[PDB]
Design a protein around this ligand. Sequence first.
Ligand SMILES: Cc1cc2nc3c(=O)[nH]c(=O)nc-3n(C[C@H](O)[C@H](O)[C@H](O)COP(=O)(O)OP(=O)(O)OC[C@H]3O[C@@H](n4cnc5c(N)ncnc54)[C@H](O)[C@@H]3O)c2cc1C
Length: 295
Amino acid sequence: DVPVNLYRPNAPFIGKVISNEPLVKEGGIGIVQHIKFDLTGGNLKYIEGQSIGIIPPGVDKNGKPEKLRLYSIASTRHGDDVDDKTISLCVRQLEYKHPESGETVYGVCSTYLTHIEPGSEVKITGPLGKEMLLPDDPEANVIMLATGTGIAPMRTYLWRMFKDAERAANPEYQFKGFSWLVFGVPTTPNILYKEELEEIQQKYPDNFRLTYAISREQKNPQGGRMYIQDRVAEHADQLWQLIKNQKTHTYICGLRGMEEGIDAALSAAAAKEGVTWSDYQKDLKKAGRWHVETY
Ligand SMILES: Cc1cc2nc3c(=O)[nH]c(=O)nc-3n(C[C@H](O)[C@H](O)[C@H](O)COP(=O)(O)OP(=O)(O)OC[C@H]3O[C@@H](n4cnc5c(N)ncnc54)[C@H](O)[C@@H]3O)c2cc1C
């Protein structure tokens, strides 16, 4: 079933940008864009939780052509308009410090993508990944632990679960389990897809819980800035009791670094019932119910 590598770097699909929209509001930190591509012309199909490659134009500092960068698909299999004609991405412009030898450094593929014009042609590969896939069971529980652009696989899950047009298009997937997003960003303007996320929770208060960790607006109990791991610690017992369900899947996605705090919190919960989390977790991985994509 799972489509993989319908296009490869040696002969990528040439898509066209339909749209490029700002996801970070005024007063937020950084630039994250929602970019939709036209898939007509070829046969790139994909499902939720997968990634695609984008090959940027240009050569590196060595004169060699730039390679593909991997990006979590931010749309469901059907695309944002539920026509099966497009695919979307959620791209943060990488930028950073003086210790890089220059000044402020801007990432090649991410600057290219966040500044790209509708009408522009992009080299696209994939889809890739069997690690962040959603169970076909409509009564599965789905815990989603996301920071920043790690919201992208979560968006594909939630849109498939809860969008009116998605439910109408997917007769076999009528989600009636429980899902819980814990989403961590620096500010409220940085809550990507905030409006749609909150409308899902208003529409399905019993099937979807939304929790934010906003570091510039909230403090954890020890006085530090609030991060996703603090929220997982706060709800460690609850999250552990859902994780004990044979049908619960947990997904972690975002830049690398949150996993160590998530594990310490869940470890302390499981220890209360004589269970060593790290061992339970290894069994969850083998079972295909512990999903991780950090980068
Ligand atoms: C499976 C997967 C999925 C991904 N999904 C997404 C996504 O949905 N959205 C998204 O925005 N990104 C995503 N990324 C990351 C994305 O692929 C690119 O790595 C990222 O966009 C930066 O690429 P670039 O071309 O902009 O940067 P480059 O020009 O390749 O710059 C990156 C390099 O500069 C260095 N560097 C980076 N940050 C720092 C820092 N703080 N300090 C010092 N040196 C640094 C490192 O050498 C790094 O290799 C994903 C990565 C993977 C592996």
